[PDB]
Ligand binder design. Structure first.
Ligand SMILES: */C=C\C(=O)N(Cc1nc2ccccc2s1)C1CC1
Ligand SMILES: */C=C\C(=O)N(Cc1nc2ccccc2s1)C1CC1
Lengths: 305, 300
């Protein structure tokens, strides 16, 4: 038993990370088939990033302006292109380590694993969630640009995130792998704030079910509530509304414990009243909202890849 | 910026995970060169888990009593032997994916990554710490025995933990890769219980420094302490004594932030007395003790 925040094994993705340098900027690239993906702002100068004209910045560059380095082997670039905010670099040779993969775009409240890299060499791996305000609370230092997020289904890697920038609030912003930003963000050095975060309600309830599956029962109670009554108290504590589809998805965990979702909502309702104040659940003094229902089930049932 | 519990990239260990079957029991093994390592209790039957004599069980075994699978491939065992609590299966093929590696024995407070596996197949990776009572607070369903913990430095994998057992209290015990248990535990299913656990004080201080490095100072105060008066207070909160060696270990983080170690000790002293008062540190509403001083500089 036990319950930790668990990242997907990262080996399928480790073999796809390369170093991409365009004139004194260096960040990370994703090498799949014969194409290397990376943030388009790698073509920006430290003076062009205030208000970049990306059409004109790319039309000036040609293939020789990009050095791609896979470990210590140089990759010769034979074509360059832009799709939304990602730069596509076509290379001489295809990646022999290319996994079965698929570009997907995730909803807020879904989790994924991030392979943090620096100069194209993977450094660490962690589990994070796409926040309702479309940021992630990651760990990224200078030169982590281009690190990707992903999930694994059987043997297929779903790439869902590429890291572009840090917001002044410390949180991070990026795109899917087709270059579309998550959230209302642009790739410029301009003041950009995110909306007020809210809490992913359905993940909080799923984590509470993982608590009772591990013996933590002191927060339970008998009084049920209505969906309308709960959504009103969720409104006041900046919790996301709980939809009827969230209750259905929580169906499995409601069975495995015999606690109705709306019973758990009163447990969560009362926990939102005067709090925990040092009282803990699964070793946490706050309510954790970065575990999906599928995460709770895949860890309380041992699915591998 | 940002500070997260971060595991090492698991790719170099994924290539070493195999499945070891003996009689009716299947667990994970570690295929390095032409040797496979697994917990020795793989040779136990149902009447063999209270008081097994492992020497007697192993002498009755032929090579073909051990089935080893690496994916679809069946590896042929050409010899077996035992080192403390680890069984070593010599196979006819050296693992082509064997990384540069070392076996190391860690000390309480040290962190490592766990590659949880089921049936030789890697399921997930996470960071955890060797607790002062020599257990780990892992995530380990049945049939995850033989999952290993590790660190990676440059491109050399230091293996430090093999999982063997879950204890009545829900926490986990295992050995180094020479088969010697961490703590006073034996691979028998007779009643065993971990000693009382304590917070890893030197790790909490490193995490406070990491909070200052990431831009939070609200928990500092104007006070200092002596090493002795800190230890007298901390132990009333179930905290590990802070030795002189620990404060030397925190010297680099101290120089980087400009805050003396004993001043941060006064800070921790007050946090234990007051709580957070509705605030959080690096995303947490309690004091975090599974980040070493080395973990902190690698992530900041
Ligand atoms: C990922 C490392 C990093 O922070 N930088 C700094 C930059 N931030 C932005 C934001 C918007 C557009 C362009 C850039 S560059 C990097 C060198 C890559
Ligand atoms: C690998 C699964 C696991 O940990 N267990 C618990 C066991 N403890 C011991 C102790 C001594 C000898 C053998 C075993 S197995 C089991 C499913 C059985």
């Amino acid at each position: 038993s036990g319950f930790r925040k668990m990242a997907f094994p990262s080996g399928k993705v480790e073999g796809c990370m390369v170093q991409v340098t365009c004139g004194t900027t260096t960040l990370n690239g994703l090498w799949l088939d014969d194409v290397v993906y990376c943030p388009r702002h790698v073509i920006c100068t430290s003076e062009d990033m205030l208000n970049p004209n990306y059409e004109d910045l790319l039309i000036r560059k040609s293939n020789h302006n990009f050095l791609v380095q896979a470990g210590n082997v140089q990759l010769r670039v034979i074509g360059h292109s832009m799709q939304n905010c990602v730069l596509k670099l076509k290379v001489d040779t295809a990646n022999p380590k290319t996994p079965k993969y698929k570009f997907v775009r995730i909803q807020p409240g879904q989790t994924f694993s991030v392979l943090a890299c620096y100069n194209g060499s993977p450094s660490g791996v962690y589990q994070c969630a796409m926040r309702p305000n479309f940021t992630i609370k990651g760990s990224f230092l200078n030169g982590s640009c281009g690190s990707v997020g992903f999930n694994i289904d059987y043997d297929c890697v779903s790439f869902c995130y590429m890291h572009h920038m840090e917001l002044p609030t410390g949180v991070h912003a990026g795109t899917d792998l087709e270059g579309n930003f998550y959230g209302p963000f642009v790739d410029r050095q301009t003041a950009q704030a995110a909306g007020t975060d809210t809490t992913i309600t359905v993940n909080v309830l799923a984590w509470l079910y993982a608590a009772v599956i591990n013996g933590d029962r002191w927060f339970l109670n008998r009084f049920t509530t209505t969906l309308n009554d709960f959504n009103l108290v969720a409104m006041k504590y900046n919790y996301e509304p709980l939809t009827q589809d969230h209750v259905d998805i929580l169906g499995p965990l409601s069975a495995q414990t015999g606690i109705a979702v709306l019973d758990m909502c009163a447990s969560l309702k009362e926990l939102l009243q005067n709090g925990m104040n040092g009282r803990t659940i699964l070793g946490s003094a706050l309510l954790e909202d970065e575990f999906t229902p599928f995460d709770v089930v895949r860890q309380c049932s041992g699915v591998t890849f």
